[PDB]
């Protein structure tokens, strides 16, 4: 149909290539962000069911853009490699010219700008990745959560999920989290993200990856034994 054109504006008002991007986000891993008062917890699936895989050199889904800016993603791994690279360069650009450390909010916009640009320029596909960019603003200790979409726009939610079986996760996020009050403690906040991920992973120590990002360049990924500890405690409740 109109899938062969981008320039052609379409009376449907909807260019099919754009629709098809969404199909692509769905297929990918589930990646979730839930934020406290002092933390972003990012719980994400990393598949590891692959036989004869040396896990050490296989890239973790989470990639440090900046020293305090992180990215998780759902959608095609190849296409996603371009966003990570543009975004890294721009990170260091920011410091080189403003001196100021990376404004996260600029960065959210910069990234979306690329998925937008390519919607207008024929002969350049719109990317079929949606991302989570999360960070902490210069001179600030309030957590910051953003999602980008392949529609070439951006938005902030109090907590959000993307990728396979996101429908299932969204019910959890409505009932156990609230915009009004995020779980004040870091600890509360991490335990709920583990329970959400369990709904679609259905038991895995390394299939669940938790990276907690705190203010002031504090990045630490939870220990496999500690992750295992969240699971067992939760699993006792399930039969009660």
């Amino acid at each position: 149909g109109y899938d062969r054109a981008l320039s052609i504006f379409s009376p449907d008002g909807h260019i099919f290539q754009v629709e098809y991007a969404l199909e692509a986000v769905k297929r990918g891993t589930c990646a979730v962000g839930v934020k406290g008062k002092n933390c972003v917890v990012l719980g994400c699936e990393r598949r590891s069911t692959l036989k004869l895989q040396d896990t050490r050199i296989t890239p973790s889904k989470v990639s440090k853009i900046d020293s305090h800016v992180v990215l998780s993603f759902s959608g095609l791994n190849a296409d996603s490699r371009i966003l990570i690279e543009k975004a890294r360069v721009e990170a260091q650009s920011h410091r080189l010219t403003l001196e100021d450390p990376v404004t996260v909010e600029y960065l959210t916009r910069y990234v979306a700008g690329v998925q937008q640009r390519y919607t207008q320029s024929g002969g350049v596909r719109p990317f079929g990745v949606s991302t989570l960019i999360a960070g902490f603003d210069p001179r600030d200790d309030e957590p910051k959560l953003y999602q980008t979409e392949p529609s070439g726009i951006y938005s902030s939610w109090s907590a959000q999920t993307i990728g396979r079986n996101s429908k299932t996760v969204r019910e959890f996020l409505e009932k156990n989290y609230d915009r009004k009050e995020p779980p004040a403690t870091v600890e509360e906040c991490v335990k709920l993200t583990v329970r959400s991920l369990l709904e679609v992973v259905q038991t895995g120590a390394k299939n669940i990856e938790i990276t907690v990002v705190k203010p002031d360049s504090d990045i630490v990924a939870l220990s496999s034994e500690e992750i295992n500890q969240y699971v067992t405690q939760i699993e006792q409740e399930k039969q009660e």
Partner: protein, 244 residues
């Protein structure tokens, strides 16, 4: 669905899964088998040749195996025509990096950059994806011996052992079944020869149908020594392993 659209990379399939990429899989698999086994004491690269004519000189062609630099070698499977652009760029890029920092290229770097051109041709430019898979065999001191594979799509995944091109599934079922976790380098050669004889039409696995190289950390005083074995040393070791 019905009307399959795929003229350009930019034009999406209804499915959303670009058919040009799909056709790329077929092509890879067209070519014979290549196999990389990473061992704790070397890497072994062993493959059955594409060519089969005796008139055509199989012996002087190591179509599968080219070295890019002193530490890094690649096994190639797919489209010969397309492939030739990428092997050449990869050598120059490696030497560009050595110019800059006066250190050997890290394995991980060299793959990620090449994968990114492969994406480049779908991201922009009608230009077909250059549908080729390499198995990279390299060494760096960041992670030791490292093995990678690259998808035509333009993404990579590490592996403990992998097979590419034709009959990937059969060779894969055997490797995992008898896998020895530690892996000795002597062992890897034996194990490789067993897998190829079962997937190779000649079940006597003639030498003239074989390409072989071994990259060894088990080379004196703890160093990395790449050695391309000629058809005459393949033949001597064929009689050592006893298939003939």
């Amino acid at each position: 669905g019905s009307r399959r659209y795929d003229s350009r990379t930019t034009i999406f399939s209804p499915e959303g899964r670009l058919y040009q990429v799909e056709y790329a899989l077929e092509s890879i698999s067209h070519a014979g088998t290549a196999i990389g086994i990473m061992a704790s004491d070397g890497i072994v690269l062993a493959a059955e040749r594409k060519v089969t004519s005796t008139l055509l000189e199989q012996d002087t062609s190591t179509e599968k195996l080219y070295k890019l630099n002193d530490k890094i070698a690649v096994a190639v499977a797919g489209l010969t025509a397309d492939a030739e652009i990428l092997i050449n760029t990869a050598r120059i890029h490696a030497q560009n990096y050595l110019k800059t920092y006066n250190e050997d290229i890290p394995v991980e770097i060299l793959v990620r950059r090449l994968s990114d051109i492969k994406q480049g041709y779908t991201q922009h430019g009608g230009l077909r994806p250059f549908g080729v898979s390499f198995i990279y065999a390299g060494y760096d001191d960041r992670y030791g011996y490292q093995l990678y594979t690259s998808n035509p799509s333009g993404n990579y995944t590490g592996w403990k052992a992998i097979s590419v091109g034709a009959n990937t599934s059969a060779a894969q079922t055997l490797l995992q079944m008898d896998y020895k976790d530690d892996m000795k380098v002597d062992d890897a050669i034996e194990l490789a020869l067993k897998t190829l004889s079962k997937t190779t039409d000649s079940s006597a696995l003639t030498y003239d149908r074989l390409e072989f190289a071994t990259i060894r950390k088990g080379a004196n005083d703890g160093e990395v020594y790449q050695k391309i074995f000629k058809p005459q040393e393949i033949k001597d070791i064929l009689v050592k392993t006893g298939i003939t």
